[PDB]
Each structure stands twice: as C-alpha cells, then as structure tokens.
Design a protein around this ligand. Structure first.
Ligand code: HEM
Ligand SMILES: OCc1ccncc1
Length: 292
C-alpha cells in the first residue's frame, strides 16, 4: 500500500508559491482570446481535476501527487483530449519557476483559475513530488458522460467523494464549453462561462431541456437558450438525493462556494499524506487583492 508523503520544495515558502500564482493569473489575464474569448480559466480547472481524478483509494495509485500527466500514456488518454492546451499554457510558467513540481503546478493552475474567475478561495498545499514514468496510471480511470446517477455515485466513491461533494464539484460545468472534437459533446452550460457562479444549478432547474442526439451521435440535453448538459449532469436532477442538493446550491451561491472549495481541495489532495508539521494550507491573494 503506497504512501505519498508531501515534501515541500526545498527552501520554498508561501511567498514563492504566491509568485507562481501571480504568473499564472497574469497569463490568464493576457491570453483572453483563447476558445472564442473564454480564456484559459476553464481548461485549467479541468486539467487540475483530470490529473487528480485518476486516483484509486483502494491502492493509492494515480492522483495529483506524481505529476504523471507529463508522460505520454496519460497526456494521450482520450479522456484528456483538449487538456494539451492547458499544459502548453503552463509551460512558460514552469520555465520561470523550474523548482515547482509538476503536480503542484497543475493543481495550482486550477486553484488560480477558480479564484481569478471570482470564485471562492481554495486553500492549497504544496509538496507533491514528481514520480517516474512507470507510476503513470493506465487510461480509463476518468468518468464517462453517457451514464446515470448510479454510475456517477459509484464512480466518485473511488475518490472518496460523497453526494454533497459530487454535486458541489459538478458546479464547475458552468465553466467553459464542451467541444465536439475533444469529447463528442458540444456547447456551454450557461451564459457566464468564465466567471465562477452557481449558474449550473439554476440552469438545471429552470431551463427547458430537450434530449437530442448531437453530430457525434451522442445524447445530450439542450435548452432553448443554447445551453447543454451531459447525461451525467442531468442525472443530478433525476436522483432524489442529488436533486435536493442541486436545489440548495441554486438557492444559495455562498453555500455552493463553501462546499466547492472544500471538495476541490479534497480532490486535489487525495492520495497525499501531509506530515503533521507541514505548513498550513496556503490561501493565495488574487491579483486584485495585491494591486497587480
Ligand atoms: C461525471 C463526472 C464528469 C464528467 C462525465 C465530465 C465530462 C466532461 C466533458 C465531456 C467535458 C467536455 C470536454 C471538452 O469537450 O472539451 C467536460 C468539460 C469540463 N469539465 Fe467535466 N466532467 C465531470 C466532472 C468534472 C469535475 C469534477 C470538474 C471540476 C471540478 C469538471 C470540470 C470541467 C470543466 C471546467 C470543463 C470545461 C473545459 C473547457 O471549457 O475546456 N468536470 N467535462
Ligand atoms: O463546459 C460546459 C459544460 C456544460 C455541461 N457539462 C459539462 C461541461
């Protein structure tokens, strides 16, 4: 039973990681034309989730710790199609700060993106350590989109996530868009797709959804407003337990933000043992808070 102990990059402290945050945030501000003016925020969130979502609680394989997305087996996972854009965005940041581990950089990209998109503060811990190519998880550990609530619940239990955590994490589907060439799905989840809000839940409950087969022959739920939901998204209003939580978050964005922050930190930390004397989690200032 593999143990991965967090080990702080030698000699580095909060201020050093705040500089990496700031470089990511400045580049997010600059590269505003990407994906028809969405910017890189959403793809960075998806990247941080996909490098973490390979985790298996039963044997501690996968997860964010080892930075294994840098190896071709994982980079070329069909489930990761499109994430190469996020990797390429982070390359100049890694060149400026070569001392940071790959797992720390990929996870920090997601935290930075959420915060810079006016989302909640997400506490973040350093100390992921790059592991060798033979520790890369096989493809097939990330979730299918064509499934129902039972599939979603079973899937997320492999990551030690419960119903509230699942529903909170899925709120990230307000961000960005699906792209037919990446995943065989097409369209945004709502209007505000580069500002972090509770729109996903509001749209699930309030839109007029029609089940359609898209140009890749996959089923998705499409609204009159030009929004879409995957079958796994729509399952959150089919399952009674999930539906109750969707209503809670549609009614209270502050609660969503609190629950998302916890769930996303947990996701990004799964598999990692933090020594009892490790630094406390860092809460990075936004560029705005620093006057930058
Ligand atoms: C059942 C679980 C999930 C399924 C089946 C799923 C599936 C998908 C699919 C098919 C796409 C479109 C990819 C593309 O065409 O570019 C997507 C996008 C996205 N996913 Fe999820 N997802 C899941 C959970 C999550 C979680 C837990 C998060 C983060 C907390 C997340 C964040 C995102 C973001 C931000 C996008 C937009 C990316 C972009 O605009 O480039 N997803 N997801
Ligand atoms: O990226 C927007 C989106 C919308 C619905 N499901 C997944 C992703």
């Amino acid at each position: 039973t593999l143990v991965h102990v967090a080990s702080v990059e030698k000699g580095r402290s909060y201020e050093d990681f705040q500089k990496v945050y700031n470089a990511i945030a400045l580049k997010l501000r600059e590269d505003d034309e990407y994906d028809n003016y969405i910017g890189y925020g959403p793809v960075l969130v998806r990247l941080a989730w996909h490098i973490s979502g390979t985790w298996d609680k039963h044997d501690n394989t996968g997860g964010s710790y080892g930075g294994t997305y840098r190896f071709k087996k994982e980079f070329n996972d069909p489930s990761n199609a499109g994430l190469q854009n996020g990797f390429k965005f982070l390359e100049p940041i890694h060149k400026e700060f070569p001392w940071i581990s790959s797992g720390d950089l990929f996870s920090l990209g997601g935290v930075t993106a959420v915060q810079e998109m006016q989302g909640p503060k997400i506490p973040w811990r350093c100390g992921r350590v790059d592991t060798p190519e033979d520790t890369t998880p096989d493809n097939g550990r990330l979730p299918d989109a064509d499934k129902d609530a039972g599939y979603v619940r079973t899937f997320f239990q492999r990551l030690n996530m419960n119903d509230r955590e699942v529903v909170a994490l899925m709120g990230a589907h307000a961000l960005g868009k699906t792209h037919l060439k990446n995943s065989g799905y097409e369209g945004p989840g709502g209007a505000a797709n580069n500002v972090f809000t509770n729109e996903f839940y509001l749209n699930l409950l309030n839109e007029d959804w029609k089940l359609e087969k898209n140009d890749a022959n996959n089923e998705q739920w499409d609204s009159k407003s030009g929004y879409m939901m995957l079958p796994t998204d729509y399952s959150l209003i089919q399952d009674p337990k999930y539906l109750s939580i969707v209503k809670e978050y549609a009614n209270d964005q502050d609660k969503f933000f609190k629950d998302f922050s916890k769930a996303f930190e947990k996701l990004l930390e799964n598999g990692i043992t933090f020594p009892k004397d490790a630094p406390s989690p860092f809460i990075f200032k936004t560029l705005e808070e620093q006057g930058l």
